[PDB]
């Protein structure tokens, strides 16, 4: 049986939207926190039309294809996928995980009735990758320096949110951040961690020493 | 009315393609007819310089989030 | 089963973390009655990305794996941890403490599945702790 | 039987890295070049004894120790190693790979005689991945940016150059190179790439673009 | 004579290429190497400020109407 | 057998290169004699290494790539190409144009082991057209 | 056999182009008038040549060459083209249509000779549409 | 003589320890004692800047490779 | 008063770590408070030069003898 | 039974430590003199506190422990140590070292009573040779 959402929880997290923007953590946060049961296709697309602005909506549509066709893809390419069945006849095609098939179109009931549990779980977290990549170009890290008056958690902050918010991988970031902590961070601190007798191989580890050692004032 | 839609001089593009999305899907036109309408409103609204960059799109551009997206990326910081 | 904690309850103490501080007696007290009933690693981990910055986010990460660390050496030092067992294959590794064991990865619901009550109590218990260190060292 | 390298090879390429440095794409090719056929501790060690000062050549023997016992560690996670052999009885000590073995120390002619193939070929790897090392070692990608009279071809030979011969993964590279590109590269030049109508992924595509649309002057 | 003919300080762009196509089409070049001729002389001729807009071409233009048409619609009013 | 070219040579090339730049005739005339006897991927390879900077080296591996995506195409378009064979089992792959394939990444006694003369002479004449194509573009 | 369009007309539809200009509804007029009947490439060509000044007949002849493109497109996606045939032999080149293929180039009546009427026609429509583009672009 | 140098204070360090280095191990000492006289001349010697350096060393240096390292990355760079 | 001690401006560090710690061990305080009670009067007085030299310390100083062999290693010869 | 030192001897050894400083050959003798019979850690600990200023007994009770802790890590590298016993009931713990131990703290009649003779002349060189270094970094 479908419960649709509470429309006092879209209200707030349409107005958190509208003041925090796409891409806040709490922003991600609170759309993780509504994207914790699996939705019918039917509840994530009625959640972004009502969250989402027109423009955001229609690069939102785009990316959730894009995402659902690669999820296709690897089912296809697996007949293990727990979308899919052991036979032939129970593979997924887009029409049933866009909610366009037949005995579903505009109807949530019967979605919730032909959908599989493996078919709503591999729709959510393609909507939530979808939701990412649209607030990832809605709204430079090798451009930020530390100010002369900006204490050192800022700009490791500002830092470490302008690059896991670009285009690198996800495993060259880490180095990435230390060598910008290394030559960016103005020359006091520069030559406070070139001259660590320990060698520091995190950004966590640079920031605590930093901390520790920083000349206060 | 969507057809006297114009991208102010100080406007940004995300506020205009806001404003013309609304404006057009919350008209009188046949839902069929929506997209090929915001996609040449894009193209001869939104002042000469979206326009030149519209223009000059080596990939052809066939919806309007397409568009928003390359807009997005190729657009003038200011 | 697993229950996601009130995003209301967590914007309202990602802004008491924002007025007040990390420091504050209010906040360590909100972060305690937020740390009240058990939580699955999801949660922790979930909890701190929201709550905390990108910088405190990462030192936290640091001191909650050096006090899961100790955690685990305290635990093969006696077999008679509540996270452990009797025999040596519910032995308890860092992947099964830090959510990253098989068939818990992304998934709270497995999660909840696997994870001993001890376990949970043992991992919060860390992360509180790695909590104090962290706002002791931003400020 | 043992053959000694030539002492006319080892004295050019000693001149070699006397004039060019450690770490010229030059020097490698002729460090690649005497290290072609496969040789034994004592060809490798005194090599690097003639053609590297004092303290490179302490550091160079570190690296080399290290990166035989990856090897040593990688031999005793495989029995399939091509210096190992099926039995307990080939196994491959590490006083074995450095020439301190029984029967080996000092002697290249019994060397030759006990090494196997795959020894030689291991160590001779080791010594390269190490000579990488130290070279890399003995002489900041971040702090790179294109002087106001400066060509483009420079600003990316340099910057290349810098981002290769650092400390980043190798995954990491081509992104970075391309987010330099982005950022540094004066405002024309930023802006020209700004302005692509097509979508430049890789850091030949953006040099080939840069080069052909670039302001002659 | 073709390879006299250059674009004049105050002088449009398109009377520079009705110009130039005329002298290049009656004169003794083959049929063949006109167009490879209008284009380089689009390039080289065509002071400086339009040699640039032709160069920084994020698509290739490889024949002289689309190379009229860039120009027309990139051009600097004025 | 695997014979490499003179590092002397090479240096000359190098230096070459140095001086009259990549488009000189002088130049073309040096590399076509360096590029006179079949090459295997690995030595083309570390020559463009040795002699072109890092930039023209990224410039000379795409047209390398491209030109010989161009005749990996000719090849499925003529079953009749040197480097192909006659039945499907000798159908030849970038894999094994670039040096890529199995039994050849980093050995080059068994790339010259495997390769087939025409696969060579491909090889060689495709990364004779990128040269000249990245010195047309360098410059 | 082919017969020329009268230089009267064509003189006369020059001077209306001239005075009236590209995209005046009357100079449309006159030229759908004289693009009646099936024109060949010669001869209309010829026309665009005339009527059309040096820039404007560039344009033209791009615009032509996409427009017949994009026939020989649908050609290709329909065997039954009124241009084609029925089996293979019969496709029609881009050749075929611009007049460039083998004893058309610079003959009339040899084109006259092998076209079709289906040709004809299409090379027709596909000139008009041509200079439909290129006068709205102009002005 | 190997116990007379000196770090000149213009001197780069890794000419200094190719310096003591060679005169070090072409002496009269046994080759077992040449490692910690080096060690030892490296930090007696090398001018103050230097020697407070390889003193607050939070980790033990005990070989003259990792010395040189050490100093070769925390070096002023002037 | 221990509390009351501060480094003056012109006396060195050995006679102000003599005064302090005599001040320190005869006073009311438990035995147990003596060191970590040094230790941070080390840090807070001793004019910002030290303070800033005990700061910037890549190890940790745990004793009151390693803050002073440290701080006399690395103090500003004048 | 224990017997403490002369208060005349140490004053004129405080004295001698006064005029000739840490360092001189007369002041180590002197300190070998009075170091002759294996002391109590309360009769070296006392005569430290007598002879040396505030901070140099910082440094050398710093030292002595440094000492003390290798001399332990040698004596659990050797069951064979004067200060140790056979089993592992008479293993030496540093609180039984630096007169720590139950039994011990401020008395030193019983610290004499517990105390084996090679704990004593452990203790005894550990303390002389902390001496020497604090007396070589003092000045």
Not at 102 to 118: S, W, Y
Not at 128 to 157: C, H, K, T, Y
């Amino acid at each position: 049986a479908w419960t649709p959402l509470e429309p006092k929880l879209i209200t707030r997290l349409a107005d958190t939207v509208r003041t925090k923007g796409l891409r806040s953590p709490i922003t991600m946060a609170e759309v993780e926190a509504l994207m914790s049961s699996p939705l019918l296709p039917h509840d994530v697309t009625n959640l972004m039309r009502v969250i989402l602005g027109p423009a955001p909506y229609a690069l939102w549509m785009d990316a959730w294809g894009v995402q659902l066709q690669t999820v296709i893809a690897a089912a296809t390419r697996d007949p293990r996928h727990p979308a899919n069945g052991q036979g032939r006849g129970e593979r997924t095609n887009l029409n049933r995980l866009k909610g366009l098939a037949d005995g579903m179109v505009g109807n949530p009931q019967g979605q919730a009735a032909l959908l599989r549990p493996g078919e709503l779980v591999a729709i959510t977290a393609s909507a939530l990758q979808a939701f990412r990549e649209v607030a990832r170009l809605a709204e430079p890290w090798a451009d930020i320096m530390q100010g002369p008056s900006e204490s050192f958690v800022d700009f490791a902050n500002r830092l470490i949110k302008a690059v896991e918010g670009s285009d690198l991988p996800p495993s060259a970031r880490a180095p990435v951040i230390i060598d910008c902590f290394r030559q960016k961070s103005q020359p006091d601190i520069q030559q406070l961690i070139r001259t660590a007798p320990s060698t520091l191989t995190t950004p966590g580890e640079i920031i605590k020493y930093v901390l520790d050692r920083q000349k206060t004032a």
